[PDB]
C-alpha cells in the first residue's frame, strides 16, 4: 500500500496520485487571489483574474 | 499616475476589457498617463453579541 499512503519526503504530505490529480486539472490562474499591489504592473501574464 | 506602457505614434487612448479608458495621452506632450480609481476596499466588522 505504498502508492496511496502519504510520503513524509514530500513538502506538504500529498500522495503521489494526488500530485497527478492536481497537475492534470488546470485552474483559472496559478494563484487563487491577486492582491492589491500585485496587479499594479501590467505584466503579460495578468489575465482577467484582477 | 505614471505609466510604463507604449502607444503607437497615432493611437490616443488606451481602452481596457470593460471598454473604459485607462491610458491617456497628454494633449501637449508625448507621455502616457495611467488611470486608477480612488483607493477602495471592503470593510468587514467582527463583533460578539451586542
Curated annotation (Swiss-Prot), chain A:
Residues 15-36 are annotated as: Fusion peptide 1. This is Spike protein S2. Precursor of the fusion protein processed in the biosynthesis of the S protein and the formation of virus particle. Mediates fusion of the virion and cellular membranes by functioning as a class I viral fusion protein. Contains two viral fusion peptides that are unmasked after cleavage. The S2/S2' cleavage occurs during virus entry at the cell membrane by host TMPRSS2 or during endocytosis by host CSTL. Residues 27-50 are annotated as: Disordered. The lineage of its organism: Viruses, Riboviria, Orthornavirae, Pisuviricota, Pisoniviricetes. Disulfide bonds join 39-50. It comes from the Viruses. The record marks 14-15 as: Cleavage. Residues 34-50 are annotated as: Fusion peptide 2.
Amino acid at each position: 500500500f505504498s502508492q496511496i499512503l502519504p510520503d513524509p519526503s514530500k513538502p506538504s504530505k500529498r500522495s503521489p496520485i494526488e500530485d497527478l490529480l492536481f497537475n492534470k486539472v488546470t485552474l483559472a490562474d496559478a494563484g487563487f487571489i491577486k492582491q492589491y499591489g500585485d496587479c499594479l504592473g501590467d505584466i503579460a501574464a495578468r489575465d482577467l483574474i484582477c | 499616475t505614471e505609466s510604463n506602457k507604449k502607444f503607437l505614434p497615432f493611437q490616443q487612448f488606451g481602452r481596457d476589457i470593460a471598454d473604459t479608458t485607462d491610458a491617456v495621452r497628454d494633449p501637449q506632450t508625448l507621455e502616457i498617463l495611467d488611470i486608477t480609481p480612488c483607493s477602495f476596499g471592503g470593510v468587514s466588522v467582527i463583533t460578539p453579541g451586542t
